[PDB]
Design a protein that fits this description.
The structure is a homodimer.
Chain A (H helix, E strand, L loop, with lengths): L10 H14 L6 H17 L1 H12 L3 H27 L14 E8 L2 E5 L7 H12 L3 E5 L5 H14 L5 E3 L4 H9 L4 E5 L2 H12 L5 E4 L5 E4 L7 H13 L11 E5 L3 H16 L1 H8 L7 H6 L9 H10 L4 E4 L3 E2 L4 E2 L2 E4 L16 E7 L2 H9 L7 E4 L3 H10 L5 E3 L20 E2 L5 H6 L1 E8 L17 H10 L2
Parallel strand pairs in A: 2-3, 2-5, 3-4, 5-6, 7-8, 7-14, 8-13, 12-13, 14-15
Antiparallel strand pairs in A: 1-17, 6-16, 9-12, 10-11
Helix pairs in contact in A: 2-4, 2-6, 3-4, 3-6, 4-5, 9-10, 14-15
């Protein structure tokens, strides 16, 4: 089939209710149970790595090795992190107390929230459904997951496999499109994590508002790459890192390099270096066949057998092809509609008001803009929505510090792109229209827990008792007036 | 007049726009500017303490000394905390890194969000508008404040005074009711803090959804007081603390003791002790006059000159009087409609299904329920919404641990009520229908900032470069397959 069966609307309340009852019955309360579930989800990933790569290949045309690097290995590391550090994360923290409260016994405890809803996306369909789930389960919640309908092979496989590793009471699954997503959003959760578009995020948050449910929203935006004039000697590595970040998933990544702002004098060397990096990574034969300079017996079959990922659908393909009109095609521009293939394309001489420099590209088009001074960079970046990532290539500390301190983004990476998402120890999240909240590791545990302050007092007298109790006497007034001036 | 002029709907966009432009022009970016504003707000409170107490007295009939303890002193301590610790809070944190990312230079920086909206409430009308504001300004934001129309004297005075201490570009003010609140909620903010009801919180969060604006919601619920059988010798102090928490603001506090769950054998001694505490705190003459056992020449004038706060309005008064029907009036029940006076009233023999044990009381009615075992306590508490506070009176460690670990609330205090709100070092906030997010001190700074991860790399080779780059060769597959075995 290659598609999961849609969950009936009548079964959606039952699925959520079973997860609710399971939470209430301590199904994931004890740390032993949480570690068992995490270990079982590790087994889910490890025992079925080959078939998941094949399903992801069917959905995305993403090569197995790309999927291993981007999804399988990060998931494995996430499970190991959460199991290894769980005992540390669950313990109460002793906060720094000042004044009268310092004499009492105070703690910050962490407690589970209840049932967490995770709404997945299609571009990394295993990572972006399981990574949030692992965190929610580490914090002692139960969960409902909603796989993206735009990665149906992955959704089918995950739906088939998951019950063999984790109970449906602990992790429920709702499959379908808008109808089923709308329906599950009417049910009451204690937290919702959504990855996807700002448009749909508004709808998710509106639904969450009806139950006063906290939300983590992982969205996108136009992640800029700033390249200054101190990287001439590093230009090959600069171009290789930028081009890699663009080539993965055919540009369809929330932290992909969206556009470049390069120092005026470095434009030619950067563009040439990006062209060389592109040839190296895609290979001569692929490009020649796509260009029409090397014949093959079955061109469409050749492209469907290639190592280069597909655009999600025809609508997104046409949108990306129209974006090429907003500047000069300096490098690339090769495409095949039938196989939804668009090679990485560098645009120069951009009209900044054109849609290509107004909307998140989320594809193989890379606009290149120039700057002369810091003010030019800030005008480009600060006039647009706060992106999930911001990238700066530079060997100059003062330049890097200036760009960091005068911009806002979900993260900053200096001299690389994308790799911060796999970094164990950083919270991953957006700000403004790139989203709210953050997760990964400790930050998943915190996001899917309630930090609950506890103050323990004795029955002895203390400084608060000198003034708090009525009746309001002249003596009390004199005591309080002595504190005031 | 005793009332602020309503902000015209046409001026609301202008007010927000001026604050937005001020933020964009770095009006509160530099720490010098932030400390100047905080010091000026300290001067606002300290120079006008007498007049604020009088305005709050006009609105609430709250005694000056009660206002000093509950609002003035906590605000003073908040400003001192934020000024003293600002340099500590702004500095980057070095996160604990694991795996490949441990070789890179990583930081968690804090940056301002933009413009913060603070919607105040009426019950502590200075504290619950200024305390959030102080935090927002400490984090380098500008702000718009919306004072509650149900504390008009305080709203008028604050609106008059605030521009003399802080610029209208840095702190804008919108005055009015539903029309003006609805209008300001259409404007784009980078964070909204709302204190009030769960009902209106849903409307606030729906408005926030339209701009993907994060929200901190400080709501209410029925904060239970659990009293076990190990406090017989401490029963006077137990009763004094509970009764004080109820008497302040005539019960109209989001963390007031809403109801009591007392061990079966201790019911009589607790109720008697609460009665004695009530007499001590209110005085014999006040109660006698309210009961109608002592005549005075001007009864309504006598009650309006009393030290006991007023119910907010006639509607809330009638609701609280009807709550007395849900059990036996064991202690109190004295009231005067004209002056909106209801004395603290202890109800026994409660019908748990009656509205008095279904809704947040937010008034002088204190239901007393009994328990025999832990299961009885948990059935009462866990069948209701997660309250902002939970209180446990006990000398038994195992009992306290059991109640803490099996309940969820915004906070727990052992052997006291309410006082945790003034504790320097604890985050203050709810969970579920008592709210989301938290603030006070460091936690205000964190709530009104974006924690922004920064990863700095060099141009040298590292372990990620062995596998990330295409082309996807047989050699790469062998390298990645070696990691997956």
């Amino acid at each position: 089939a290659g598609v999961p069966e849609n969950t009936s609307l009548e079964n959606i309340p039952v699925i959520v209710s079973k997860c609710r009852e399971a939470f209430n019955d301590d199904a994931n309360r004890d740390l032993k149970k949480r570690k068992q579930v995490l270990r079982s989800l590790l087994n889910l990933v490890e025992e079925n790595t080959d078939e998941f790569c094949k399903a992801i290949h069917r959905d995305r045309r993403r090569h197995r090795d790309e999927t291993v690097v981007m999804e399988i290995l990060p998931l494995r590391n996430e499970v190991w992190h959460l199991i290894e550090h769980m005992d540390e994360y669950v313990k109460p923290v002793k906060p720094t107390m000042e004044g009268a409260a310092a004499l009492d016994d105070c703690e910050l405890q962490y407690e589970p929230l209840g049932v967490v809803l995770v709404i997945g996306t299609w571009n990394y369909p295993l990572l972006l459904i399981l990574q949030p789930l692992l965190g929610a389960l580490a914090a002692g919640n139960t969960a409902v997951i909603k796989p993206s309908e735009l990665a149906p092979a992955t959704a089918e496989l995950l739906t088939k496999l998951l019950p063999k590793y984790v109970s449906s009471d602990v992790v429920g699954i709702v499959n379908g499109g808008v109808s089923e997503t709308t329906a599950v959003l009417k049910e009451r959760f204690d937290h919702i994590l959504y990855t996807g578009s700002a448009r749909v995020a508004e709808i998710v948050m509106a639904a969450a508002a009806k139950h006063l449910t906290p939300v983590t929203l992982e969205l996108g935006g136009k992640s800029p790459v700033v390249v200054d004039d101190t990287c001439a000697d590093n230009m090959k590595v600069v171009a290789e890192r930028i081009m890699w970040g663009k080539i993965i998933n055919a540009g369809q990544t929330c932290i992909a390099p969206d556009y470049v702002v390069v120092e005026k004098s470095m434009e030619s060397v950067l563009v040439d270096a990006l062209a060389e990096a592109r040839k190296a990574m895609l290979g001569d034969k692929f490009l020649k066949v796509l260009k029409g300079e090397l014949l093959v017996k079955q061109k469409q079959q050749f492209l469907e057998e290639s190592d280069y990922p597909r655009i999600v659908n025809a609508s997104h393909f046409q949108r990306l092809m129209e974006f090429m009109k907003g500047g000069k095609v300096a490098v690339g521009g090769e495409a095949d509609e039938a196989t939804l293939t668009i090679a990485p394309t560098i645009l120069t001489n951009i009209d900044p008001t054109h849609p290509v420099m107004q909307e998140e590209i989320f594809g193989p088009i890379l606009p290149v803009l120039t700057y002369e001074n810091e003010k030019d960079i800030l005008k480009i970046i600060n006039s647009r929505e706060k992106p999930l990532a911001l990238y700066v290539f530079s060997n100059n500390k003062r330049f890097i510090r200036g760009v960091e301190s005068r911009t806002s983004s979900g993260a900053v990476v200096v001299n690389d792109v994308v790799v911060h998402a796999g970094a164990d120890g950083l919270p991953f999240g957006g700000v403004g229209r790139s989203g709210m909240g953050a997760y990964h590791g400790r930050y998943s545990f915190e996001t899917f827990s309630h930090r609950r302050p506890v103050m323990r007092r004795g029955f002895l007298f203390s400084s608060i008792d000198t003034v708090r109790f009525p009746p309001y006497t002249t003596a009390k007034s004199r005591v309080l007036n002595s504190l005031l001036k």
